[PDB]
Amino acid sequence: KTTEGAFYTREYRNLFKEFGYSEAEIQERVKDTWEQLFGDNPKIYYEVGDDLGYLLDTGNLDVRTEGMSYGMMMAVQMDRKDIFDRIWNWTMKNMYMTEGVHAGYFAWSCQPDGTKNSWGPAPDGEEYFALALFFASHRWGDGDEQPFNYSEQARKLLHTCVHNGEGGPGHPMWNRDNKLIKFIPEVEFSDPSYHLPHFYELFSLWANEEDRVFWKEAAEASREYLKIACHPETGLAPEYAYYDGTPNDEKGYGHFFSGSYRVAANIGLDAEWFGGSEWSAEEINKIQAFFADKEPEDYRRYKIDGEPFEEKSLHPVGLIATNAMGSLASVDGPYAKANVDLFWNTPVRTGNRRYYDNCLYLFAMLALSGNFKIWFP
Ligand code: NI
């Protein structure tokens, strides 16, 4: 480690402020971003009745565990128990599976009416659900009424993630030998953007005790994995990658595209929470170096070696936001201020592809203003 993280100091860097933005403009911008996403201006969050709500993937017309778990994380960071509970309530009602091989997990995609489009889960959903739930327990207390017994729900979910398939036909979400998160439970490859060692550090404190060593090991395995998965010159990570670190392009996910964008963001947040490292600063410096001579209107899909496709980035605003959030891992970096300034000058996205960009956008607003916090017991 290179700095002491917010986990130890309990002080979160306001990078916007350190980079010269006013406290009042920062506060305004964070709130505006929240309101444009969750307020009643068509927006990614939709209230339903007195007790339900969801985040809608405006592009695919579905509700994803990625968005629901994001929404819960967002709501707890913002101290909005009412929104948290609406979303978690819908998730438990419509997504949680009690039948089939993936019982104990959440169906990754549902229609807006709650109908499951698949009984397969998406591990990046599970890990955000668990952490958001631990934060909710810590901010608000566990409810007496299920499923609002947050910390128990979190421990029980992480039990399944690690141990599924011991007493039967299910699959764990992490490989037990290499401690790496999987793309989906029935495969033996991974997805670099799913790797959240800063989350696993907290799981090592709060999960069932029987798994606390495993989670500390997973955190360390994830850090090592990211070293091999990001290209050594450009810093770009593939969307999917084998355990050996190389891209899995069997179905076209072996390049730098939408999934990959979260790698830079995850690295920035881990640096802020658990401390900088030389590897992380150098990695962000490489990503930002690669995009320094590129205009946002021209962002493409790239091979991880930097070779451009004709195809444009489908989510260039999300790319901007994650690259900016990555600056938390290289606050003195040569491109860190340009990236934060570019994000500052990029509005929240409109149109039917806005959901993914805007989730990344709010996470970056929170993190860069010192508002993406660890909530302790
Ligand atoms: Ni203002």
Side-chain angles (χ1 to χ4, degrees), residues 76 84 131-143 148-152 154-155 375-377:
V76 68
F84 191 103
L131 194 58
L133 286 158
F134 281 129
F135 287 170
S137 181
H138 303 160
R139 291 210 81 164
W140 307 315
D142 285 2
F148 310 100
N149 50 331
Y150 307 123
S151 66
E152 305 180 78
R155 290 190 300 263
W375 299 97
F376 287 93

Side-chain angles (χ1 to χ4, degrees), residues 110-121:
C110 290
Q111 283 308 89
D113 73 2
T115 307
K116 293 171 180 70
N117 292 327
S118 163
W119 286 17

